[PDB]
Amino acid sequence: NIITVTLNMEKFLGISIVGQGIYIGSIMKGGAVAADGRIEPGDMLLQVNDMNFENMSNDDAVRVLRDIVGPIVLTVAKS
């Protein structure tokens, strides 16, 4: 259930992120994540391209994700 969606085509993920401890709050039309369809809202975002958000300040992780936009590989723990 800890899926590792890696779908992407370089040029937007199309998601929103909430922090409690970081998970997917919404999926928006037209983005890479929406195209894949598997990372449902509420799934926890565990890893992005082998970078783990564990302990890492939610902001630092968010900035990292900002920085990544090469291909984006998301590891999510589906509810």
Author numbering: 264 to 274, 277 to 285, 293 to 341, 345 to 354
From the paper:
The central event in Wnt-PCP pathway is the activation of Weak-similarity guanine nucleotide exchange factor (WGEF) by the adapter protein Dishevelled (Dvl). The PDZ domain of Dishevelled2 (Dvl2PDZ) binds and activates WGEF by releasing it from its autoinhibitory state. Dvl2PDZ binds to both C-terminal as well as the non-canonical internal peptides.
The only hit, 349-GSTFSLWQDIP-359 (hereafter referred to as WGEFpep), obtained from the sequence search, lies between the DH and the inhibitory domain of hWGEF. Therefore, to obtain the structural basis of Dvl2PDZ–WGEF interaction, initially, we tried to crystallize this protein complex. Despite extensive efforts, crystallization trials met with no success. Furthermore, we tried to obtain the WGEFpep–Dvl2PDZ complex structure by fusing the peptide with the C-terminus of the PDZ domain. Due to the lack of structural information on the WGEFpep–Dvl2PDZ complex, their binding mode has remained unclear. In addition to the WGEFpep variant peptides the minimal hWGEF (330–581) construct, obtained from our solubility screening, was used for the MST study. It is interesting to note that the affinities of WGEFpep and N3pep are nearly identical for Dvl2PDZ, with dissociation constants (Kd) of 45 ± 5 and 54 ± 7 µM, respectively. Furthermore, the substitution of tryptophan (WGEFpepW7A), aspartate (WGEFpepD9A) and proline (WGEFpepP11A) residues at the P−2, P0 and P2 positions, respectively, with alanine completely abolishes the WGEF–Dvl2PDZ interactions.
